[PDB]
Amino acid sequence: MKANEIRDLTTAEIEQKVKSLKEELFNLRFQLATGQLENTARIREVRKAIARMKTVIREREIAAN
RNA sequence: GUUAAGUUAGAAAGGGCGCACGGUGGAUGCCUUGGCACUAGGAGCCGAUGAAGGACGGGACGAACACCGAUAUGCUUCGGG
Numbered sequence: 001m002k003a004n005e006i007r008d009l010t011t012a013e014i015e016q017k018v019k020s021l022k023e024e025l026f027n028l029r030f031q032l033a034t035g036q037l038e039n040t041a042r043i044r045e046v047r048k049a050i051a052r053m054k055t056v057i058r059e060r061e062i063a064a065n
Numbered sequence: 066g067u068u069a070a071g072u073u074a075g076a077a078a079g080g081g082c083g084c085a086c087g088g089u090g091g092a093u094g095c096c097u098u099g100g101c102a103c104u105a106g107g108a109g110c111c112g113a114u115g116a117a118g119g120a121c122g123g124g125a126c127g128a129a130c131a132c133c134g135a136u137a138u139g140c141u142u143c144g145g146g
Contacts, residue, residue, distance in 0.1 A: 002141075032125075040125045051136035059141070 001049075005056050018053050021046055
């Protein structure tokens with residue numbers, strides 16, 4: 001998904017992207033705490049996706065100078 | 066029936082010697098995951114762009130070892146497989 005990450009422009013790669021993933025992780029952890037989640041690999045894959053987005057943004061910023 | 070006299074003893078409450086069968090306890094034999102002494106090549110410094118060394122944390126489900134820092138049991142890119 002890294003290529004698709006590059007294709008998006010910078011604001012789109014943070015605004016309404018690293019925010020929806022954050023809120024989804026929040027809801028997922030709430031459901032797990034309550035006691036009804038079933039599928040549990042979602043947490044790990046969401047966290048990995050967030051890290052990917054942050055790293056590509058930082059790479060762009062570093063290359064900009 | 067009465068005198069007189071001899072006797073292995075022969076019993077064993079328990080004990081000694083020999084034999085048979087067990088229990089505790091880790092010598093001996095066999096075996097290495099760890100060490101000891103060297104040889105031939107390399108490398109002989111790290112740090113304010115924050116060191117050597119640590120504290121606290123990170124997993125779906127506890128404590129500990131190993132691994133990693135709010136991008137936390139991991140992220141990109143180039144090669145091997």
